[PDB]
Amino acid sequence: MNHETFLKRAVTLACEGVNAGIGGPFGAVIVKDGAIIAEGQNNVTTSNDPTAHAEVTAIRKACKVLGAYQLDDCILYTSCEPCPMCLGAIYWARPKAVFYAAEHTDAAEAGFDDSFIYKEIDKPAEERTIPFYQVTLTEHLSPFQAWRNFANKKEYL
């Protein structure tokens, strides 16, 4: 019905997700034309997938349902403010809007601080917790060349 009810459904999902031991306190919902096209819950541990956050799980499901890779005319509801990873996913997916209940400071007080990642994505590379090394390969442009060449390429941007 209204944004509250859907967002309410997302928080309910997070709770059921916890009590059922499938994952962390995160839930998400994606709707299109007033229909809940997907429901996601954080299931990182229970499915050995560090990228399995509520929003990422809902996106994957939502796209599978639409047999598409873009979430046009869709709205994403998360029980809490998206993580940087989950944010990049939002922008690659392209929903027209996103709503969230709990803030990231709330997640931090709970033991789920994603701040260290905002700090790192802001740094260069060589200056990072996890060291990033850029190796010089004479053929580093090869895959872009193979792409310019491939005719039947389905552009996804």
Next chain:
Amino acid sequence: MNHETFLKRAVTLACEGVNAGIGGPFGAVIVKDGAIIAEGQNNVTTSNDPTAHAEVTAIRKACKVLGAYQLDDCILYTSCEPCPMCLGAIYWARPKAVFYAAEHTDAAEAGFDDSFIYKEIDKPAEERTIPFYQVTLTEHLSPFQAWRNF
């Protein structure tokens, strides 16, 4: 002094607009008795007015010139199909007719797509992207009441 030349003029204003850095690619003119009464251009950024679209501007100026709030006997020539708020403004301004060159499609292929607003306007308040709330007040009818008297 011809339908085509007036529309052409709106388009010429549309270009000058972009060029002079005064705003987006949109121009409009209103004519009365074969003469151009007012001109508008998209100047939203340069005047801090998000309602400052070409058509909207052109009719505000015209109404001022004519000292009226209805343009019941004027024509609007606009460089492109009107935005929805512009259509609303047109239905309130009430001109004889309106001409346009570019269509809502041409503008969409330039980063200017209003269709999302069309969709939104159709959807009831609850479904709209932007959050809408209808709190109920025990006197939410008093303004109309006060109107029934005046």
